[PDB]
Amino acid sequence: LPPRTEKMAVDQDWPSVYPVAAPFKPSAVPLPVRMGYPVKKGVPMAKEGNLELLKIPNFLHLTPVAIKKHCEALKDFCTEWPAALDSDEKCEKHFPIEIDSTDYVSSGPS
Amino acid sequence: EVVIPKKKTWDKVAVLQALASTVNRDTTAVPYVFQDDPYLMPASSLESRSFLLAKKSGENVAKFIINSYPKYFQKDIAEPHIPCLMPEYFEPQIKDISEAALKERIELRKVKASVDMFDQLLQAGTTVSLETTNSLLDLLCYYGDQEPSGVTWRAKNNAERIFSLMPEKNEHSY
Amino acid sequence: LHVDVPKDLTKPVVTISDEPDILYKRLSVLVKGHDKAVLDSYEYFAVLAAKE
Amino acid sequence: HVFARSPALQVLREMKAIGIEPSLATYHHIIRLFDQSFIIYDIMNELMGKRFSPKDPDDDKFFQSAMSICSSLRDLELAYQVHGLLKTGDNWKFIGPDQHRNFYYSKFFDLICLMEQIDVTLKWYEDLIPSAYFPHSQTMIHLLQALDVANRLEVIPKIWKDSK
Amino acid sequence: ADERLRINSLRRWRLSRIVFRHLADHGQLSGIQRA
Amino acid sequence: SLWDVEFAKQLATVNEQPLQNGFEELIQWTKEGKLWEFPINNEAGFDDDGSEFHEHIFLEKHLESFPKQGPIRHFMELVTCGLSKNPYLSVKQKVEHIEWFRNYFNEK
Amino acid sequence: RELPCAWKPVTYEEAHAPHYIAHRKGWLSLHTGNLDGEDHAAERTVEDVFLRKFMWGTFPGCLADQLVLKRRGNQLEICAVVLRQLSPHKYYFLVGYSETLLSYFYKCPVRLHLQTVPSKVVYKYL
Amino acid sequence: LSEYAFRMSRLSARLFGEVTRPTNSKSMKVVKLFSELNHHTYAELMQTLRFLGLYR
């Protein structure tokens, strides 16, 4: 069957094509991007069947349009810094104690 | 003056729900449940249904294998623990002649085992509480003496027998 | 979608509690990777989100 | 059938009087008992803008039945109202199984092809197929007939490529 | 085990060099390059 | 009873649709508990039996039945100082160690 | 005839040698284990070994190339490149089976992203 | 080493929970001791899925 990038318009809503982190789909990404060390009198390989493009952690789901649209919807969740605390001079005056704690984000089951 | 703001809170999936509300449906794609590969996109409604049933059949074969051999999947490594990814046990664990084995068999919805167990209790001369009998009738009446997978009500069926056997019949049983 | 659009969307429930909010003077995010380009892309994403 | 219509309206009035809010299954039952039909307009006027929650097992049969009426009465505005009710919030969950989804959308698109201007018909065609449903052959004949009555014959090759 | 510790008180990848080499050469161990 | 449970699961089906996109899949996995909860909290699902610090750091109330001024007091003070610096054990395991010590020294 | 008379396609991953792993090739598996300060590299390695043998035994003669094993949080994405020789129904059956089995074996949400190719993508001939 | 520094340190030890009594170093090993703390599955699973007709 023919790839659906042939049906994608030049003014589509790209974030709706890649909402979340997804692997590179050469039938969904409408770019003639090539990757690979070319052979003698050769060219970098095409995307269809390219394992190297599939090995990249692509940022197609985070484009500037998508990021701005995300961060406009996430503003509802935020609070405001008390404006009285303009600088560290007052952060060390009104709140003498500082508590430092760390979180770690790895990949795995645990 | 330091006016500390109030700590607004949200549900765990709230951020995901907002991000999801940000994006519309992809008009040039088949539903998310299918594969995005051109060879694996369904072309027709019957083909789409066939692919979905094939996927579900694969899932059920995997689940059958998981439940039939729990010992190979019991090794938990995930913290926090995930109960929904553990094997499910469908056999009755209590074997002795008591109301405990009976209520366990009612909990597991083993119709034939439950009715046999009740007959055994009656043979041993052990009095069964009213609540256990009500549970047994609930099970039998919902399932019509058939094991969980129409069934027509058969005369003198085990439901009717147990019902006639109760010394005391309350509102729940009727 | 050119015509078929969701008529309304269910915004998630964010409640303004009564307790006071925690205050962070600093928040350092150290990201480690085997790839410099991935870290540059992530830096661009994170900085743009922080600005927005 | 016919003898039960005024008893059914009496029952609906009783539910609304005694403080029990009707669900989608109730209006489903009323619509089918009456479809054997201007009451759908009143039901829609009531239901416009509402979000529903699962209360009866038969709620998922509503939109199907409702769309059937818009198919039989040959009214496009009522169909757009029904689809707008479907798209209000999370009401789309009620559309039902795959069979009911295909049934609902097939009648909705048949009506669109029959009644909408060909530009809007094509916009709906590209928005609904294949993302929402896979069209049947009869729906494709209906789209061809709409193109014919519109004298927009230039699009037949694309429609046929899609049908293939 | 614990008893032994008590009475005492009273007184990187876990693969073979070969199997590691194969995976590291095939690029299957994330991060492991050649110098 | 079973009737109510089955009616509830039948009401569950009426809005039982397939997933529509990736975000919905992540939401379903988060609700089922299969996916981690963000922002990552490395101590998620662990509370240590609701113990407080004084139950870890002050373990000297479990030495009351031991000798109060002999060398046994010295040894058990060393043991409890070690145990109170142990972040890998729960209070129950520490007190079990102390009780084993009690039993052993009671026999001897 | 007489003594004086007398006197293989490779894909990109196969063609390039191990000393190109960060120059031309990449890493098939991507996880945080081997970074400086992280832990459980051995467990992730054993997991990768089992995934690869399982997938090569569950898709016999279908896989065109090596798997790509990606890991984000507790997610586990297998991006495989298979052929269009097996029927799509069997592909869906196997995808469901393998996803469920691996999720219950690793107690994590495993996922599979098959990519069909008409035939092996030959890079050069060695 | 003055007395003042000596049991000033011994008070500090009581505050931070270290061993107040100076227990030399050989007998402090108790402090360090108490301060700290499947091919079958793989093969059997592989063979069973082989027998069920889903592996190799």
Swiss-Prot record, chain A:
Superkingdom field: Eukaryota
Subcellular location: Mitochondrion
Sequence similarity: Belongs to the mitochondrion-specific ribosomal protein mS35 family.
Quaternary state and interactors: Component of the mitochondrial small ribosomal subunit (mt-SSU). Mature mammalian 55S mitochondrial ribosomes consist of a small (28S) and a large (39S) subunit. The 28S small subunit contains a 12S ribosomal RNA (12S mt-rRNA) and 30 different proteins. The 39S large subunit contains a 16S rRNA (16S mt-rRNA), a copy of mitochondrial valine transfer RNA (mt-tRNA(Val)), which plays an integral structural role, and 52 different proteins.
Protein name as catalogued: Small ribosomal subunit protein mS35
Organism: Homo sapiens (Human)
Curated annotation (Swiss-Prot), chain C:
Name of the protein described by the UniProt record: Small ribosomal subunit protein uS10m
Subcellular location: Mitochondrion
Species of origin: Homo sapiens
Similarity field: Belongs to the universal ribosomal protein uS10 family.
Subunit composition and interactions: Component of the mitochondrial small ribosomal subunit (mt-SSU). Mature mammalian 55S mitochondrial ribosomes consist of a small (28S) and a large (39S) subunit. The 28S small subunit contains a 12S ribosomal RNA (12S mt-rRNA) and 30 different proteins. The 39S large subunit contains a 16S rRNA (16S mt-rRNA), a copy of mitochondrial valine transfer RNA (mt-tRNA(Val)), which plays an integral structural role, and 52 different proteins.
Swiss-Prot record, chain F:
Subunit text: Component of the mitochondrial small ribosomal subunit (mt-SSU). Mature mammalian 55S mitochondrial ribosomes consist of a small (28S) and a large (39S) subunit. The 28S small subunit contains a 12S ribosomal RNA (12S mt-rRNA) and 30 different proteins. The 39S large subunit contains a 16S rRNA (16S mt-rRNA), a copy of mitochondrial valine transfer RNA (mt-tRNA(Val)), which plays an integral structural role, and 52 different proteins.
Top-level taxon: Eukaryota
Family: Belongs to the mitochondrion-specific ribosomal protein mS31 family.
Subcellular location: Mitochondrion
Species this chain originates from: Homo sapiens (Human)
Stated name of the protein: Small ribosomal subunit protein mS31
Swiss-Prot record, chain G:
Primary location group: mitochondrion
Name of a matching Pfam family: MRP-S24
Thylakoid as UniProt keyword: no
Subcellular location per the Swiss-Prot or TrEMBL entry: Mitochondrion
A GO molecular function held by the record: structural constituent of ribosome
A Gene Ontology term for the protein's cellular component: mitochondrion
Family statement: Belongs to the universal ribosomal protein uS3 family.
Subunit structure, as described in the record: Component of the mitochondrial small ribosomal subunit (mt-SSU). Mature mammalian 55S mitochondrial ribosomes consist of a small (28S) and a large (39S) subunit. The 28S small subunit contains a 12S ribosomal RNA (12S mt-rRNA) and 30 different proteins. The 39S large subunit contains a 16S rRNA (16S mt-rRNA), a copy of mitochondrial valine transfer RNA (mt-tRNA(Val)), which plays an integral structural role, and 52 different proteins.
Name of the protein in its database record: Small ribosomal subunit protein uS3m
Gene: MRPS24
